[PDB]
């Protein structure tokens, strides 16, 4: 069985109702990246930034938000491949988890987690973060921040990811824009180590020409159809 590494971006969750920085102008929920997606933004206006992620966290857990067919297809892929499958996502949502995927590497963190500003320890969290919420890991309880990797910060699980990139027989990028590094550079790593590279996207990423195989269209239709050939090619 081939070793498969899958990278997913915001495009896969778009059909589920989760939006991100628009291609047209880079605004996320009509907010500048710089104000809500940087360490500096958090420092100048912690009240606004905390409120922003409170809204995102609440929106994520609304009844009408569900994993779509593309999420489900990836869960089936892991079932079939087991240990030879690894899922890395740039998304902070939990739709991969809800779909049935396990050991998902959230390289940009998770919306449903917070982090101690003193220990750096992550903490499961589903509600609002108020100023009176503190950590549970320190003798002297510290303030909490979203467990989301901001621009200017180091992504998570990079060592595991680069190891899988060198081992992967097939690398599949799904719903990635190609604007966000180092994630956008993963396809170059995979191809360097002899992996077969595949892009599945609504629109061609800004590195789409580096992929050997590509299919474009709605994620909920393109991803399940690519996954099924693959499962059928396994026989």
């Amino acid at each position: 069985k081939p070793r498969v590494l899958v990278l997913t971006g915001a495009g896969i969750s778009a059909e589920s109702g989760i939006r991100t920085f628009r291609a047209a102008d880079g605004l996320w929920e009509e907010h500048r990246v710089e104000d809500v997606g940087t360490p500096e933004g958090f420092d100048r206006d912690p009240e606004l930034v905390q409120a922003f992620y409170n809204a995102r966290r609440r929106q994520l857990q609304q009844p009408e938000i569900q994993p779509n067919a593309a999420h489900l297809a990836l869960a089936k892929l892991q079932d079939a491949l087991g240990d030879r499958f690894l899922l890395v996502t740039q998304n902070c949502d939990n739709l991969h988890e809800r779909a049935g995927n396990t050991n998902v590497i959230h390289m940009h963190g998770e919306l449903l987690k917070v982090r101690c500003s003193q220990s750096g320890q992550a903490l499961d969290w589903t509600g609002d973060v108020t100023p009176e919420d503190k950590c549970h890991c320190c003798q002297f309880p510290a303030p909490l921040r979203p467990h989301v990797v901001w621009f200017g910060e180091m992504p998570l699980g990079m060592d595991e990811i680069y190891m899988a990139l060198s081992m992967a027989d097939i690398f599949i990028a799904i719903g990635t824009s190609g604007h966000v590094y180092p994630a956008a550079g993963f396809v170059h790593e995979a191809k360097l180590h002899g992996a077969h590279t595949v892009e599945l996207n609504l629109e061609p990423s800004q590195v789409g020409n580096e992929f050997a195989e590509k299919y474009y269209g709605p994620a909920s239709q393109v991803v399940p159809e690519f996954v099924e050939k693959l499962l059928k090619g396994l026989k």
Binding site: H108, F151, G152, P155, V180, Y181, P182, A184, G185, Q206
Partner: peptide, 10 residues
Amino acid sequence: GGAKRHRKIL
């Protein structure tokens, strides 16, 4: 791979 960054800086 370095820190999380966008291709466009300015």
